[PDB]
Symmetry: C3
Subunit: 149 residues, 3 copies
């Protein structure tokens, strides 16, 4: 049984030109690209994306940092929501484990390269926010017999 998670490369990932390296880490585990789109995030969509932080003092500066080019992604795999969070590492790069994206690429939480859904409910909500159903692509990986039990 597979699930789908929402992963988003933030503007610092675009501007530091590590998009391909990020994608390769997820492809390396046999996770399937189910959707992908480059866009420029707007405050209106970011307010909904970060609805959990509404009213908090840091929300205006988070939205400002995120107003820029982003790569919206959906990846599919076993336990991929929790696993992608593990691969990303802790919010604060200095506390993230070696070998995670944030530890390997970043210094501070405010520029930590990538977002990933933190739960099944948030993944469903975030995928629906950033993608229309017609943009989610269903196909089978040819190596499936060697990736899955």
């Amino acid at each position: 049984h597979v699930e789908q998670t929402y992963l988003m490369i933030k503007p610092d990932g675009i501007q530091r030109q590590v998009v391909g390296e990020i994608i390769s880490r997820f492809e390396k585990r046999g996770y399937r690209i189910a959707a992908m789109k480059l866009t420029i995030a707007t405050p209106a969509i970011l307010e909904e994306h970060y609805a959990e932080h509404k009213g908090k003092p840091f929300l205006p500066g988070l939205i400002e940092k995120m107003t820029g080019p982003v790569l919206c992604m959906v990846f599919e795999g076993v336990d991929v929501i929790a696993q992608a969070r593990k691969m990303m590492g802790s919010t604060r790069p200095g506390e993230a484990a070696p070998g995670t994206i944030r530890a390997d690429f970043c210094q501070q939480a405010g520029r930590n390269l990538i977002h990933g859904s933190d739960s099944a409910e948030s993944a469903k909500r975030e995928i629906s926010l950033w993608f229309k159903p017609e943009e989610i692509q269903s196909y089978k990986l040819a190596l499936s017999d060697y990736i899955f039990e």
Copy 2:
């Protein structure tokens, strides 16, 4: 004082075409390739390899998944039995530490890319099962003075 461990790239490592990447991880630490052989694992040899699991319900499907091309390897180094196990990571990739082979490449225990001996006794048994003595090569690494104390 060095020891030798038996490492085997399973059919998923061959079919996903990551053999060279796996070998490079062990070469990177200055471990010496003492033996290397491509073969196709058969049920009779796999029954002896997995003798500890005889009779268990999961063994038949394990043998089926392992019936395929494998790369038999012997690596030599300080504490290499335990260290190779650490490098592979937990049997279940989702529990494996970031930076390990199974965490970086895999999703499920039944397709977890690689086997390594779990003890000195199993290394001796497994090397004897999969290799003839003529296939174990004795030579010295030229960089030894910069690898070992």
Copy 3:
């Protein structure tokens, strides 16, 4: 607020020809190269460098193993003293976390590839020992807005 740490590639890092790989790991986090110099370490300077270890049983052999080409480096970043130590990993490569330099490249404490300052005080002292102030270069990284909060 950024700080500066002293990092030194030991003779095993030079001789195994992994200098570039080491530098890339620090550049990948947006750490800035503030100083860099190839020299051959001599006992007199190494005695001052390792002054804290005076009298310990491994010191004479440590000085012998360190008498050779070294790459002196200063890197700048947020919390870079502690973070570089985390990236290097434990003194013993066998205890170091997967994904650290020592775990990925080495086997034994006596050949563990790299030195890094362990504190703000030792970083100040080591930078002054190996570099004159005129050798420390100040410039701003063009991607600073995407590395720092």
